[PDB]
RNA sequence: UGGAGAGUUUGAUCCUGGCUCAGGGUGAACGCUGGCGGCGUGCCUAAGACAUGCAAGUCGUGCGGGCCGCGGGAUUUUACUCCG
């Protein structure tokens with residue numbers, strides 16, 4: 001079992017004859033702090049059920065994060081829709097310098113030392129999806145070598 | 151060895167997009183408050199106007215004097231005059 005941080009919860013609303021009718025969404029990261037994180041987005045008529053639903057979804061949605069001493073192999077920019085995330089390696093003693101959303105994700109993947117910047121649409125959902133892709137897309141000297149053989 | 155973002159357009163959503171804030175800085179000023187020291191710093195305006203004192207002189211080993219004194223001489227008549 002992993003840690004489960006909740007980034008964003010919000011109440012949405014649909015219209016119906018005589019009144020508005022509310023739903024709830026919840027963004028949840030789950031991770032072990034050792035190279036596995038999962039992002040999950042879950043909606044439901046009550047907050048509780050939505051958070052729970054989200055964690056579940058988050059576990060069905062995990063990722064290889066190739067740490068290298070609390071940080072990442074290289075720099076990556078990822079655009080997701082209009083949201084862009086940059087992710088930069090840092091020596092130790094730096095911290096995770098990042099906004100609320102990518103930080104929670106980087107924390108639970110066991111990144112300890114990383115420089116970020118949100119560019120673009122600063123939309124939480126979309127920033128989180130970009131952060132995931134960004135991690136998702138990390139390679140290392142190892143796998144790159146392996147890719148380039150013949 | 152270096153990079154955090156948030157609030158606000160909607161019933162709700164995404165995007166655009168402005169506005170606003172959190173940070174650092176100061177020859178400061180204003181309020182409330184005020185114990186000590188060290189080191190810095192102090193007319194941003196009228197390059198307005200200025201009382202009063204002080205702020206560039208020194209050299210007699212370049213030169214000749216004036217003025218106020220004192221001493222010694224040429225003089226034993228008291229006027230004149232040489233030197234220091």
Ligand SMILES: NC[C@@H]1O[C@H](O[C@H]2[C@@H](O)[C@H](O[C@@H]3[C@@H](O)[C@H](N)C[C@H](N)[C@H]3O[C@H]3O[C@H](CO)[C@@H](O)[C@H](O)[C@H]3N)O[C@@H]2CO)[C@H](N)[C@@H](O)[C@@H]1O
Nearest residue numbers: 177178190191192193194195196197198199200201204205
């Ligand atoms: N007298 C007060 C004001 O002086 C002003 O003039 C001032 C300026 O001309 C000059 O002041 C200077 C200033 O220009 C420049 N920025 C340097 C420094 N800041 C000031 O310094 C001046 O005043 C300070 C004390 O205040 C003195 O210690 C300094 O030695 C003197 N030069 O000298 C005057 C003061 O010395 C205005 N004339 C007027 O508003 C009024 O005279």
Ligand SMILES: [Mg+2]
Nearest residue numbers: 079081082083
């Ligand atoms: Mg784009």
Ligand SMILES: [Mg+2]
Nearest residue numbers: 120121122167
């Ligand atoms: Mg924008």
Ligand SMILES: [Mg+2]
Nearest residue numbers: 159160166167
């Ligand atoms: Mg409108």
Ligand SMILES: [Mg+2]
Nearest residue numbers: 159160161162
């Ligand atoms: Mg509204």
Ligand SMILES: [Mg+2]
Nearest residue numbers: 122158167168
């Ligand atoms: Mg904005």
Ligand SMILES: [Mg+2]
Nearest residue numbers: 188189190191
């Ligand atoms: Mg002083």
